[PDB]
Amino acid sequence: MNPPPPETSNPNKPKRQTNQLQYLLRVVLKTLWKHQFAWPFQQPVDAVKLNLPDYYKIIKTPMDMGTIKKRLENNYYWNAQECIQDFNTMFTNCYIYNKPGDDIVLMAEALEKLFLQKINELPTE
Numbered sequence: 001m002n003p004p005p006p007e008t009s010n011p012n013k014p015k016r017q018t019n020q021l022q023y024l025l026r027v028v029l030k031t032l033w034k035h036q037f038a039w040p041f042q043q044p045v046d047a048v049k050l051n052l053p054d055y056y057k058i059i060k061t062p063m064d065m066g067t068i069k070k071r072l073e074n075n076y077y078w079n080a081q082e083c084i085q086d087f088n089t090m091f092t093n094c095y096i097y098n099k100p101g102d103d104i105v106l107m108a109e110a111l112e113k114l115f116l117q118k119i120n121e122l123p124t125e
C-alpha cells in the first residue's frame with residue numbers, strides 16, 4: 001500500500017507570508033512546474049501503480065512538487081528555508097532511490113540546475 005501523502009496544512013503549525021515564500025511560489029515553483037521534465041515530480045510516488053514495493057521501505061521522508069505547490073499555496077511554511085529543504089528532499093530521494101543512467105535522474109538533474117539558478121536570486125526579506 002501507499003503511505004498517506006505529506007500534510008499541506010496544519011492548524012497547530014504557525015504559518016505566514018514572506019516576500020521570499022511569494023517568490024518561491026510565483027517564480028521558482030512556477031518555472032519548474034511546467035518544465036518538460038516536471039511530471040514525475042508533480043505528485044507523490046504511487047508505489048502501487050508503479051509496482052515499487054521497496055520505495056517507501058527506502059524513502060521515509062518522501063516529497064514531491066505537488067506537495068510543495070500545495071504547501072506554498074496553502075501558506076504552510078514559516079520561512080523560505082523550510083520550502084528549499086522540501087525541494088532538496090525531493091531531489092535527494094530521487095538520487096538515493098534511482099540509479100545513474102535512469103531517465104528520472106537526468107530529469108531531476110535538469111530541474112535541480114534550474115532550481116539552484118532561481119534560488120540564487122531569492123530576494124531580501
Ligand SMILES: Cc1cc(-c2nc3ccccc3n2C[C@@H]2CCCN(C(=O)C3CCN(C(C)C)CC3)C2)cn(C)c1=O
Nearest residue numbers: 039040041045046050052093094097098099102103104105
Ligand atoms: C521511482 C520514481 C518514479 C516516478 C514516477 N512518477 C510517475 C508518474 C506517472 C507515470 C510514471 C511515473 N514514474 C516512473 C518514472 C518516470 C520517469 C522515468 N523513470 C525512470 O527513470 C525509472 C528507471 C528505473 N528506476 C529503477 C530504480 C526501478 C525507476 C525510475 C520512471 C517518480 N519518482 C520521483 C521516482 O523516484
